[PDB]
């Protein structure tokens, strides 16, 4: 007896452990379907050409790799608001916001709740959507917060359930926290209409509760980052102060670099001076201050009217490629014969699909085609190469005829 | 009223606060000796020569930015692990250990929290030194863990009050929780000698307290990496299964990319397989996975022979520059004719000097003089060019006639 022998063994993480039990297979025709992670269509990693652009400025500058500040770069950080905000926003440029930098969406996301849990006397509720990212679960009730939900999906018709959200919604307790997807929601595919949306935000601002967006993949809806903060923006003009998280995991394909941040609505500038030091007094004892490489490249970027230009141009890209999986996935699937609707399959946005299939049928894929994915029946057809989609759907279609 | 009304304004940073209000002084001598942060000579920062190198191959090598694991980059977590435990070392050749990559010593140390907190069932307590590095404080407070404290310094006599750490130490609680900054101890530059340290050991593990290791300056308080570790190592020889953060901040200049790690010291392998386990279950809903650049360095330097040759070696000239200024310092001192006997300034290690001065000479100092530090007296010795030793001893002076 020492001093861990009572520890267990946990289990292995339901989206990033599938990484895990991939890179052990042996098989020539594996497939990483779990993880969100963009591919090319030759099924690499891809580091965004203004990325690379934007580090040789960085390396050419001889930049000091001095403490950043408890807040961040920032350049980056407004920058961020700016990005998920607007130019023109009245928020923004009125500046009752503060927005701290953080390590990718989950730092911001934990931070946020972290802030919650300290600051927000009126309840100790989260909804999140039934159902949501994995990961929300455990970054909230670590956080110390409780845990609810509100309906969302509807599998039987692969699309929202309004009616059943709408009731939800509108019987949750004044004053509650409620987790919105800003757009592509994870893991659905399957988003609110703009008109939608905008009853949401009636009821959410009738029965006076607060909105925490989760924004993971600005520009990833629509191949637009514009259209994509729709939704988030319209909010906050119907004069709902929201906070938010913001990752640049995907967007700008800084995954392990860690770029993200953490907003808070204020009522005013001041207000505002003063959440920020406190959040500041949060993160410090956290982690100090903020990894300083995926931020520059960022600022660098969203800051520069050429790099700017160039990274929509080249997010645009990924989207439409995902799209043209989309598309050639479920042709493959009536080649092979597929008797089954696969619609779902071209109409859900974002990098995955939510197809349906059970988990032996998950089994199945890995291990007979080793073809990885979450057990939920989510894929990540971003992972997908020209190369490789008549095999999946083969495989769907085999572990499915 | 609003959700942010009842938010009051927080103080500024104890220590990285002070970086703020240097930023706005405008006089063209300003000092800032609050953060313990490198410069050269010149007064500049440094970036480590064997980081550029590295730097330019990570560049070469054409990497991807993918996800790392839930633990970080494994050949720097391993690097970490050697490099803090030698290896010839049991622990560290037997595999009883488990490293994992953190976000710089502060994130490292709150893991390290955390995880007491969920899984060190006999004891809530936490010893701290008398005194300690700041956020010790917090990181402890905020992840649910009680502060208790132990005679380390005494003032009078500007050393080691060794006497009375024996007693307080001796009286401790068992299984109870033990913070030992493993060299250089911050803020007072005082360690224990070799000796003493044999002492404390034997302590510790008669009333079998949980030994927590501190160790942020590794190279720094003897500009030997080996001899700096040699009490942590000693704790483990005499079985003594302890837990560390690590810090590359400083010995290798990477304040901002955040690199450092936390190690559990298990029974065996499999024991420490467990408890990953559960360590990448508490850090999962908190950041998902850490930063990469300051990982691919440290690794790179860590692993590349001829890159270790030169890192060492520039850790010997900044340790030897530390000296020279304190040596350099005191002397001018005596030149304006100070009366008062400056000895600890040179007797003292690592990259401060605490000085002594109280609250009022503090406030001159950064009000006539713009000389910027702590207000504990403590002064960044590792912050002095060559060019302005003289300023400061002049203005130590002064406030001090
Ligand atoms: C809804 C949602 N929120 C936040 C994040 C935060 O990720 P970050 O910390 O790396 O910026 C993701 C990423 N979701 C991925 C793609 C990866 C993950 O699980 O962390 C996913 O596989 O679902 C996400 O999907
Ligand atoms: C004892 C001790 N531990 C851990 C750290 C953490 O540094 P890191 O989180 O960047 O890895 C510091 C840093 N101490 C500094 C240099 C900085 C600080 O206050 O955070 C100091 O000025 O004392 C430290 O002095």
Redesign the interface.
């Known amino acids: 007896s020492?001093?861990?022998?009572?520890?267990?063994?946990?289990?292995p993480?339901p989206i990033?452990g599938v990484?895990?039990a991939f890179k052990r297979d042996t098989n020539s025709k594996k497939m990483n379907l779990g993880?969100g992670?963009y591919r090319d269509d030759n099924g690499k990693?891809y580091?965004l050409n203004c990325?690379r652009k934007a580090?040789a400025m960085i390396?050419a500058k001889?930049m000091?790799?001095?403490?950043?500040?408890?807040a961040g770069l920032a350049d980056f950080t407004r920058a961020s608001a700016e990005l998920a905000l607007g130019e023109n926003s009245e928020a923004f440029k009125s500046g009752r916001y503060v927005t701290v930098q953080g390590?990718?969406?989950?730092?911001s996301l934990?931070v946020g709740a972290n802030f919650l849990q300290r600051?927000?006397?009126?309840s100790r509720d989260v909804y999140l959507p039934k159902p949501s990212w994995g990961?929300h679960?455990?970054?909230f009730?670590?956080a110390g917060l409780q845990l609810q939900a509100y309906r969302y999906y509807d599998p039987k018709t692969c699309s929202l359930d309004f009616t059943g959200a709408m009731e939800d919604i509108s019987k949750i307790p004044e004053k509650s926290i409620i987790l919105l997807h800003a757009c592509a929601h994870n893991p659905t595919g399957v988003d609110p209409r703009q008109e939608q949306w905008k009853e949401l935000a009636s009821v959410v601002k009738k029965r006076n509760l607060?909105a925490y967006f989760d924004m993971a993949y600005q520009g990833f809806a629509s191949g637009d980052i514009n259209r994509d903060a729709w939704a988030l923006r319209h909010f906050i003009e119907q004069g709902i102060?929201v906070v938010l998280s913001q990752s640049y995991?995907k967007n700008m394909?800084?995954?392990?670099?860690?770029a993200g941040a953490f907003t808070?609505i204020?009522?005013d500038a001041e207000?505002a001076?003063?959440?920020e030091?406190?959040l500041?007094?949060?993160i410090?004892?956290?982690?100090?201050?903020?990894?300083?490489?995926?931020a520059r490249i960022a600022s660098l970027i969203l800051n520069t009217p050429e790099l700017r230009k160039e990274w929509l141009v080249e997010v645009k890209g990924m989207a439409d490629r995902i799209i043209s999986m989309r598309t050639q996935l479920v042709s493959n699937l009536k080649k092979e014969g597929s008797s089954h609707n696969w619609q779902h399959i071209t109409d859900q946005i974002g990098m995955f699909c939510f197809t349906g299939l059970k988990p032996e049928q998950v089994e199945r894929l890995t291990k007979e085609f080793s073809i990885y994915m979450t057990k939920d029946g989510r894929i990540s057809v971003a992972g997908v190469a020209s190369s490789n989609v008549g095999y999946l759907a083969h495989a769907i279609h085999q572990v499915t005829k």
């Not at 020492?2 to 289990?11: A, T, Y």
């Not at 600051?119 to 009126?122: E, G």
Request: proline fraction near 9%.
């Open positions: 020492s001093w861990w022998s009572h520890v267990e063994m946990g289990p993480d990033l990484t895990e993880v992670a990693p580091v990325v580090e390396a001889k000091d790799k001095e403490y950043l500040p408890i390590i990718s969406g989950t730092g934990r600051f927000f006397k009126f990961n679960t455990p970054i009730r670590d607060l102060d995991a394909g800084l995954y392990g670099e860690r808070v204020c009522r207000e001076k003063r959440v030091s406190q500041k007094i949060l410090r004892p956290m982690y100090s201050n903020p990894p300083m490489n995926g």
